[PDB]
Design a protein around this ligand. Structure first.
Ligand SMILES: CC(C)(COP(=O)(O)OP(=O)(O)OC[C@H]1O[C@@H](n2cnc3c(N)ncnc32)[C@H](O)[C@@H]1OP(=O)(O)O)[C@@H](O)C(=O)NCCC(=O)NCCSC(=O)CC(=O)O
Ligand SMILES: CC(C)(COP(=O)(O)OP(=O)(O)OC[C@H]1O[C@@H](n2cnc3c(N)ncnc32)[C@H](O)[C@@H]1OP(=O)(O)O)[C@@H](O)C(=O)NCCC(=O)NCCSC(=O)CC(=O)O
Lengths: 389, 389
């Protein structure tokens, strides 16, 4: 009797998944980078490690980060000496921080996105939450449903322990949820808190130390939907095509293990080298089908894992220095916020484009690319189209 | 110049997401339930806790589980006393087990699904991995990509710390990935290992104790795609509609926290009561639009969190005793395997339907329902259509 073909035709959306609102938030504690080496070596009781402190000073001076926002404060760190050690049992304390802070910070960003969107939160049909900081059951998706008062029947996607490429992963996921479901409006929240990875310095673990110069906190929220209601909703960017891949010869480039001493990273190859070496193949896969091969002709969003990734990509491709302006401005004012970074960069780009009277939200250009980089080594690619004005 | 409308039309699939292959696997160690109370109280050094052992005997006798498969053995447990205690620092040891066992067991199930499917593994475009046992970076999705030799550009969805409703969550996700992307073939793997939750008994934590009578290990893998190639591929079930909701008055019904002592569950209400009280609303949302209100007329798959959930649902709705046969057979022969359970039940159902000469893979019936239950309290609903023969 019942036709599945008819149900399927009626159930799906028609146009491209579109970003309709972006909102961000960060912990209130602003930590200057200029003074961080002194602060970090003093709070971890490592002032005697003179040569290591000099190496960390050089890491901070080359970071290209001016400041970062951290949930962790001097007072919290003084109450948690095992978090200040390089390797001490401390997961319970870290989890107690981040199981609450991830959804709290995500809530602030989401409220800002929902206000911009301007439509009832009862129209949110799907919720994607993403974090690399802590895990719990029910997860941060259930907590944000409760905190925001979303409908209990919101369809949830809890992306845990994902890593820094997952701002691209949540976009890749939201595209399919919005496009295959008529009326669907997806709230996307990436919320990342360094309390799980902060730890003291050790001279035989310099890969862990460079994370202490770069990682910062923040959350970003999006509303994503297909078939925007003209003039009620306001498109910012459209998603057109996505990919994910594992770079060859990158085994163990970025490992991260969640243990009794928290989350510890381990770096085993040359991340800037691997990303630079494999970015062109990612661009030809995305843009050869669209007939574009001039990579200065598109707008750019790249996860700023560190400044060397950006510099080597710019050099490899001969990007004009300005292509990475929005990326570098986020790195400078917030540091590497893992999965959220790329979403802050989208917000900076559209805000500066609009503020400065450019013709599109993608710096006056039509087509754009967003890249996430992280453990695997994984590269996430999202092809975007800007919107006029 | 470029038309996004044309790209979107060309990029999407046309028909309903279809399950094209199912494969399962379990650890080799088969643990009888009849003797488990003696084994478990002896291995955890709790033989002196006489009244608690009697309560556990009653839990096991009412479980309706005949046997379970466990990665954990007597030899492993004897090497890990802190895993045998109710609450001892042990996450590092547990993580070391499950970061390897989750992908190993998932690989076995996936190979079986890929063999059934019969098509090149190079046609797998998307991979969803789901587990509640351990987390790592790169995740179990990267490990399975490597173990199976999938293409490096497979698009991955790593669902961590999800909980027992997530066999429904992976179906909900795979439906959108398959339906919105022409040609997409999704490998879905749920792989669940009790090494993260096993722990000794405590008479002030009886909610943790009932998990020790019920939780078992296993993995299940699916191939999901839209637009199956007639007679090359072989549809088993079609997905038509999905939902997820949070039952009212269920705050803290099933909490699970991942700590330095591993994953510990905490039960605070009446799960069978909450599920039974809210299942009818879930069924009317799913089936009122299809015009069906006789819930014996559809085929059933329900997460067997415990036998009381099943009994109270059967009683509430006046299901014939046979509706839950496939569900109860899985509970009996494997116990509660968290997210994988529901996928084992789909395999049992289609195998028994085919074996016994019924007309469809859904026990001779056309429409069916699959439910996942877990932390939140969350209910996942997936509406399925069977396939002839
Ligand atoms: C660290 C940088 C900002 C510095 O770049 P520069 O080229 O400008 O600078 P430089 O060599 O003069 O100083 C950088 C400092 O890094 C340190 N350093 C140098 N060699 C290194 C090595 N192989 N192992 C670890 N750290 C190293 C030294 O202290 C050195 O200063 P000196 O030797 O002179 O004292 C850049 O390397 C960077 O962007 N790398 C980031 C690549 C990446 O892995 N980031 C991904 C996320 S981090 C990660 O850890 C993820 C995670 O854990 O999940
Ligand atoms: C445990 C059962 C198999 C037993 O059911 P019966 O009705 O047949 O039996 P019964 O009362 O005679 O014995 C069941 C035993 O459960 C124990 N028991 C009874 N009262 C309980 C309570 N409120 N707290 C905890 N456990 C309880 C007692 O030992 C009792 O035996 P006696 O008192 O006579 O010694 C059933 O309750 C069940 O299916 N519950 C499962 C509901 C659910 O929560 N499962 C979700 C996953 S578990 C979870 O823990 C998830 C997780 O942690 O993530």
């Amino acid at each position: 009797m019942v036709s599945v073909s008819e149900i399927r035709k009626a159930q799906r959306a028609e146009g491209p998944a579109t970003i309709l609102a972006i909102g961000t938030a960060n912990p209130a504690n602003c930590v200057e980078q200029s003074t961080y080496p002194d602060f970090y070596f003093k709070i971890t009781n490592s002032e005697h490690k003179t040569e290591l402190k000099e190496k960390f000073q050089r890491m901070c001076d080359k970071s290209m980060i001016k400041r970062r926002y951290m949930y962790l404060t001097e007072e919290i760190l003084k109450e948690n000496p095992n978090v200040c050690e390089y390797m001490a049992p401390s997961l319970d304390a870290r989890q107690d921080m981040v199981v609450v802070e991830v959804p709290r910070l995500g809530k602030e960003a989401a409220v800002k996105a929902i206000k911009e969107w301007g439509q009832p939160k009862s129209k949110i049909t799907h919720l994607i939450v993403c974090t690399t900081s802590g895990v719990d059951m029910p997860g941060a998706d259930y907590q944000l449903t409760k905190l925001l008062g979303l409908r209990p029947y919101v369809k949830r996607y809890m992306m845990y322990q994902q890593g820094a490429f997952a701002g691209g992963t949540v976009l890749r996921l939201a595209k399919d949820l919005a496009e295959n479901n008529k009326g669907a409006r997806v709230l996307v929240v990436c919320s990342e808190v360094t309390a799980v990875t902060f730890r003291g310095p050790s001279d035989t673990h310099l890969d862990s130390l460079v994370g202490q110069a770069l990682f910062g906190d923040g959350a970003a929220a999006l509303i994503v939907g297909s078939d925007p209601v003209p003039e009620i909703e306001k498109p910012i960017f459209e998603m057109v095509w996505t990919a994910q891949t594992i770079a060859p010869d990158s085994e163990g480039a970025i490992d991260g293990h969640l243990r009794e001493a928290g989350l510890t990273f381990h770096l085993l190859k040359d991340v800037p080298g691997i990303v630079s070496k494999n970015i062109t193949k990612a661009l030809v896969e995305a843009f050869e089908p669209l007939g574009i091969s001039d990579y200065n002709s598109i707008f750019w969003i790249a996860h700023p894992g560190g400044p060397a990734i950006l510099d080597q990509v710019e050099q490899k491709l001969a990007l004009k220095p300005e292509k990475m302006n929005a990326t570098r401005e986020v790195l400078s004012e917030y540091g590497n916020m893992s999965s959220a970074c790329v979403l802050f960069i989208l917000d900076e780009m559209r805000k500066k484009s609009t503020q400065n009277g450019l013709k599109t939200t993608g710096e006056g250009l039509e087509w754009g690319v967003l890249f996430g980089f992280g453990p695997g080594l994984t590269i996430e690619t999202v092809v975007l189209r800007s919107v006029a004005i």
